[PDB]
Amino acid sequence: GAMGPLEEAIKDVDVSGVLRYRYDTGNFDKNFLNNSNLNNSKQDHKYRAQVNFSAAIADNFKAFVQFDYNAVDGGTGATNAEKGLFVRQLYLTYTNEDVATSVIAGKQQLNIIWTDNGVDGLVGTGVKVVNNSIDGLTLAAFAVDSFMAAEQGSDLLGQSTYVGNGKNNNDSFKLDSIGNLYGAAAVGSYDLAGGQFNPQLWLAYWDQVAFFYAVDAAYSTTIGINWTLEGAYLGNSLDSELDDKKTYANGNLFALKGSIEVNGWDASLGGLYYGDKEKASTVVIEDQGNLGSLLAGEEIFYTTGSRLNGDTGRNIFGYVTGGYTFNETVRVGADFVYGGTKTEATTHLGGGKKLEAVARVDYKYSPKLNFSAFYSYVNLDQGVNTNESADHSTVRLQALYKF
Amino acid sequence: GAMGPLEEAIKDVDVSGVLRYRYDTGNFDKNFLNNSNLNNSKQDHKYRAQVNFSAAIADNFKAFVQFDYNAVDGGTGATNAEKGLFVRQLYLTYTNEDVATSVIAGKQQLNIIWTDNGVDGLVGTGVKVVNNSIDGLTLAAFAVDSFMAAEQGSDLLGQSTYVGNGKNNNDSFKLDSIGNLYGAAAVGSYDLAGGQFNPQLWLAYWDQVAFFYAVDAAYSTTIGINWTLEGAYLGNSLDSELDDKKTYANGNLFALKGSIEVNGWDASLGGLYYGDKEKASTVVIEDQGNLGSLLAGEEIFYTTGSRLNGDTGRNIFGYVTGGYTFNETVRVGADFVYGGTKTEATTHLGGGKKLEAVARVDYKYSPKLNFSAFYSYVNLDQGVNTNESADHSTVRLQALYKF
Amino acid sequence: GAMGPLEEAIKDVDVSGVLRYRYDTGNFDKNFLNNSNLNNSKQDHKYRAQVNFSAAIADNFKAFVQFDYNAVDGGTGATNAEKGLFVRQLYLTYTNEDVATSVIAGKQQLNIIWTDNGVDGLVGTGVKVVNNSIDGLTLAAFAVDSFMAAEQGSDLLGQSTYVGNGKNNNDSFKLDSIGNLYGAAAVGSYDLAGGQFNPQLWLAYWDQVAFFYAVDAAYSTTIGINWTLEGAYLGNSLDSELDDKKTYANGNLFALKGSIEVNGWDASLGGLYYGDKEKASTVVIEDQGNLGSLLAGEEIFYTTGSRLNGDTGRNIFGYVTGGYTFNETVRVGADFVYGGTKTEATTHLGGGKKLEAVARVDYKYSPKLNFSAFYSYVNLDQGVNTNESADHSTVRLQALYKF
Ligand SMILES: CCCCCCCC
Ligand SMILES: CCCCCCCC
Ligand SMILES: CCCCCCCC
Ligand SMILES: CCCCCCCC
Ligand SMILES: CCCCCCCC
Ligand SMILES: CCCCCCCC
Ligand SMILES: CCCCCCCC
Ligand SMILES: CCCCCCCC
Ligand SMILES: CCCCCCCC
Ligand SMILES: CCCCCCCC
Ligand SMILES: CCCCCCCC
Ligand SMILES: CCCCCCCC
Ligand SMILES: [Ca+2]
Ligand SMILES: [Ca+2]
Ligand SMILES: [Ca+2]
């Protein structure tokens, strides 16, 4: 067949992507409760690259593809990854401008409130309809019939484990099967006089799993003293398949955070309440959902009993964060998170008071290239032996390039 | 080493490709004779993408590469494919303009009359010499020393099976080994006064398999009333390795088709005769060869006894097709195929009268983007229980983008 | 997220690469000592492609990636490779121009004197600092914490085997584990009046393996009669882990080569001395290191007893090469290598006199596209049965494109 110049063909195509290097080390003393989600890296060199292409195919049609490279070179003792790129997203977008509506069909990162919306977000295959007729307001309905589960491993509900009672692979939240996911969302962004108001409502029926419902409201000023306030409730009501088992509970999470910025300083204060004393519950579908703005620390919400994607235990946490930014370039800062998990089990496995301190540096070298580092210290008041405390420390150096 | 700008490097390069989505569902009632070639999709999302690059490397030399992505996301009950692209073709082309001759060497889609010439055509590694000294006439000689067999699965002769006699994997046409393939072809395209005449002659020796010979002639007018007439004979004579087994027969296929187009209407009428009553034979090497213009329906020639790439049974079929094209944009149409398979086996497995009706819609959204759909109904007069009939229905929705 | 035009994005990017086809056949008579490194190809079609991209990411920062395709289509009897591309190198380069210094971190081809610096060079992950403050002089320090070992197979020290004493997989140089590699180098290139002088010094500590030290000096005139002289010493001192085993010896290699070119003729003369009579030693880390300019022939230094990446036996070799270049386009030439291996083992396995003759053609079709061929004949005076000689012949046709 005929072939046209590559130079002509690329004119039709937009591109973006990410290149991320992490060097992670996570140590644990003997008494620490370990699990599939805590950082167990031993001086690993981790690379994650994604390149996204979007091509205007025909009038009102776009095709999108994402290639992903996800690899680790071991530091001490040691693999050196030999991997290629995989097609991580592949979809078609139809846009009818006359009614401000788009239909997105195929393998796509889901980007819902209960999944990670970043680099490593849950992917699935389905259809999404998005309407933007009302200025500031995005309305969406979606249906998903399969999930790219394997790539996520322990991030996905039902695929995480924890160590305890002579077993290394206790199932945090047992899921025998999963159905389609149907839902809808209303997401607002309104520029008001004093600042910007971002309310969201999300509803979703995940067949065989649960009915999920979430409401969030954020308000953010834009003047000297800038401040934000954000609150969220996420709950779910279990499907009968799980309800009949009597060892699960409906999910509830309440969260509130305030923050302030002035003269290069920033601080934040917040809290959250979630989980059940005696029964396994979940807040999100994958990892920490899109809840990053309402959490703090790095490792504490991965501790057994406190995970947001399946665990037993009632959690209450408060936190404060603060830092100073030199020259709008280098921010040095810290997080302190304190709280605990209440358990009804006689073992109280995962229970007790928990604390995390994190020292942070973030260096914005250019608008596209950011270097960062953290040192996280987590302390459990009750470890494997519950009458003794336990420490876990994690160090990360990261380079992050976006284009 | 030194590196030049990507922007300079791409000037040397031509590109083409295909993006195809299919949503297929194929149902079978209990009495239907199933096999490795009938459509057994259950609401599968199938993606096939190919991107071809050709670069002028030096005076008179081109290098070509094809990347292929071939993946399925399961609909009901469900995988979500995590696959990359593979190098499906990789070859060098030398062109001597002074004698209108080219030499093509390496891993290349074969594109012979006995293989599929489309997206999913048999690939092999070898050499091809093509001469175009005589206007309208292409002469070629070729030699192939290995085949990309695994990618083709049941499309390839010797790799198909059928269900029957308490067994799920009966071998349609047993091939213990295969040798090199040598052949030659003369392909004509002549613009005459009334229209265009396309005769072809193909000869090939496939060591350990058979000697293949095919002649085809097509004539196609170009005025109101436009019409085409095409006839073909394909035969083969088995190599001694198979001849000695006494359970195989030499292949013979005769085919004829006429078509007419007027005022947005089109119709076609044709027939074919192929196979042996009692012994296994073949017509093509892979799938349906390049015989698509001489067949109709979708699933009927995949029924056990009727496959063109290895089966037992003497087949006679007639068909008619027709449709109307609105606005040169949307064609609604239908196929009716009727005939049967004569078997000498006491079981008459695969035998009996067979029928297929297909309803079609084809929507040419742009010159490059085509949407299409079919609903196929196949009826066997003799099923697994031979004194009862059997139905098989297949629905496909397809989006096809070519560039 | 927002996406910019691909056409803009590529402006930031430099590219280079290689496309190589080899057709190799290596025959052995019954008495030949075979091993994991001799050419055992049977009319194999071998493809190796690499494409390298380097992008300016930010002020003073570059990111580099190499994609590799390494595949074989079998000739006689026969696979047809279905493989994609893998990320073979991935690294960041920081350059401070004020002090003529660069820091290179990540997965990178090592390119040290003890590894192949060509297409198939050892890759590892680590850090390199390179200083070019003194004109002509490059100073470097490096640290490597993991090796891409699997890709190299028998090229890597500790991963080669040989046939003998009723066993097919005798370990040439047994390595139970390997540590980090730290080293430094000083590499000079000085344009003097008469020509160019290229001295090198390399030092490296490979934990658990050995301390390596190498000095090389090359001198090359640039007038009628042009000539080169080059000498090298490479030695190593074994780490205690191997020293304690008493079956290994410290490495020593001495080499000298002279060459001359006049009126389209070229010739060279050289010699080398390396290895230990009774104990396993090595010269390089991977394949033949960067020693290609000090060797001749094709297969002789792969014979059991003579490998430069782990073997037992004391080797002494001399060689002469010569050829004529027609029109600065086609060189026809030959290599003759003669010597032997002294062994203290009662079997004298790998020992005896050894000879190689190679006939060569090299055709420079364009500056970027080179065709080449060789016919190599190797003769062992002592084969598997030591009182009988043994032959091994190897034919290669190659096409090589660089951009
Ligand atoms: C030459 C037409 C534009 C090509 C678009 C690329 C399709 C993935
Ligand atoms: C209406 C805003 C969401 C609910 C906030 C809950 C905070 C305790
Ligand atoms: C709107 C109040 C923000 C609270 C921030 C307090 C952090 C010390
Ligand atoms: C700042 C801490 C608030 C919540 C602590 C709960 C302690 C069990
Ligand atoms: C910069 C020269 C052209 C590059 C051709 C690409 C080779 C695959
Ligand atoms: C000469 C044309 C090919 C043979 C046609 C056979 C149709 C019955
Ligand atoms: C040349 C005759 C064409 C026959 C078409 C008939 C279909 C009804
Ligand atoms: C239109 C039908 C022609 C061939 C039918 C053969 C029936 C066994
Ligand atoms: C559009 C900015 C340049 C892109 C560089 C490519 C990164 C791998
Ligand atoms: C000083 C140059 C390296 C040593 C040469 C050894 C040649 C026998
Ligand atoms: C400097 C002397 C070069 C020696 C070359 C001799 C080859 C016959
Ligand atoms: C030209 C040959 C020099 C070295 C030969 C050594 C013979 C054992
Ligand atoms: Ca994730
Ligand atoms: Ca096929
Ligand atoms: Ca190598």
Numbering used by the authors:
A (entry chain A), B (entry chain A), C (entry chain A): 1 to 77, 81 to 226, 229 to 408
Q: What is written in the article reporting this PDB entry?
A:
In contrast to E. coli, C. jejuni has only one major outer membrane protein (MOMP), which is thus far present in all isolates and is highly (but not absolutely) conserved in other Campylobacteria. MOMP is an 18-stranded antiparallel β-barrel porin with an elliptical shape common to other 18-stranded porins. Unusually for an 18-stranded β-barrel, MOMP adopts the same trimeric arrangement as seen for OmpF and OmpC, which are 16-stranded β-barrels. The most striking difference between MOMP and OmpF/OmpC from E. coli is the presence of a Ca2 +-binding site in the constriction zone of MOMP.
The structure of the overexpressed selenomethionine (SeMet) variant MOMP was solved using single-wavelength anomalous diffraction to provide initial phases, which were improved by density modification. This structure was then used to solve the high-resolution structure of MOMP purified from an E. coli overexpression system (rMOMP). Our discussion focuses on the higher-resolution rMOMP structure (2.1 Å). In rMOMP, however, due to cloning artifacts, we have three additional non-native residues after signal peptide cleavage (Gly-Ala-Met), followed by a single point mutation of Thr1 to Gly. We observed additional electron density adjacent to L3 and L4 that we identify as a Ca2 + (rather than Zn2 + or Mg2+, or K+ or Na+) based on electron density and coordination (distance and geometry). The proteins expressed in E. coli have not had any Ca2 + ion added and we conclude that the ion was bound during expression in E. coli and has remained attached in throughput purification. The ion has octahedral coordination, with one oxygen atom from the side chain of Asp120, Gln152, Asp155, and Glu288, and has the carbonyl of Asp120 with a water molecule filling the final sixth position. The metal ion creates a cross-link among L3, L4, and L6. Additionally, the difference electron density map showed a residual elongated density that was modeled as an ethylene glycol like the molecule [from polyethylene glycol (PEG) 400 or C8E4] in the rMOMP. This molecule sits below the constriction zone underneath L3. Although only one monomer is present in the asymmetric unit, analysis of the crystal packing reveals a trimeric arrangement reminiscent of that seen in OmpC and OmpF.
